[PDB]
Design a protein around this ligand. Sequence first.
Ligand code: 78A
Length: 251
Amino acid sequence: LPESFDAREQWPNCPTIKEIRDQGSCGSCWAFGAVEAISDRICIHSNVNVEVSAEDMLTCCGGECGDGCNGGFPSGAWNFWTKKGLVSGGLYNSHVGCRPYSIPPCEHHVNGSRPPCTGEGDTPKCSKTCEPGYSPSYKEDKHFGCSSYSVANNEKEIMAEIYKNGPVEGAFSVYSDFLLYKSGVYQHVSGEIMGGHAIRILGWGVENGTPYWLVGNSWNTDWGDNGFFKILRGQDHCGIESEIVAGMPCT
Ligand SMILES: *[C@]1(C(=O)N[C@H](C(=O)N2CCC[C@H]2C(=O)O)[C@@H](C)CC)O[C@@H]1C(=O)NCc1ccccc1
């Protein structure tokens, strides 16, 4: 395997790989990390661009995925994709796809022109219809996954999975010092635990002798390094390697 790897560079025809979303004031990271990677993989394994709806995942999976804006299970999300499939849907107010995200973007632990995130948000309703003007119908717009699996807590296997099939979803323990991340390779040295956080891992590299994972957060682009961040790789730091999940799109 190469010393470095950036899925954004390796798959130039898949722009979703370089985009950063905003989960808004909702604990829907579990759903965002999933639909983002799923969007990436649909493009990688059927070369077609599709913004997989975070709204559909967040609102219709139900208990199988946890508790909506209160948190969920990443592996459950990929299961839903293979069971019920997912329709398309873009950013809030974008009017793109069957079900665009309905929760407003906000400032995540940074100042900006948007309203500060309030963290407290209810899970929107599971509506099985598309936005007015869009076609086809909700049922006709479903994209199915044909496999949902968990990648072992093994650095090399996680790299091989990414290298071959594209970005995966992972999770780690977020501590207060991570909220102020700007650049470099993140390493937890202090701060109270804020909770678990699911994200999208799209690569890896080495910075000043420090190995890292290339990750895309869902707190908009004005957070961290244009929305992305780097985190220590190889020592299951904060559990970054303890919960990798992925899957393959049908055909
Ligand atoms: C994932 C999540 O969304 N995390 C939360 C979060 O990032 N925010 C809440 C308000 C907007 C945003 C922000 O902080 O700017 C918080 C708790 C992290 C600091 O609680 C969500 C989840 O799915 N957790 C369960 C879980 C299950 C398995 C592995 C990891 C996490």
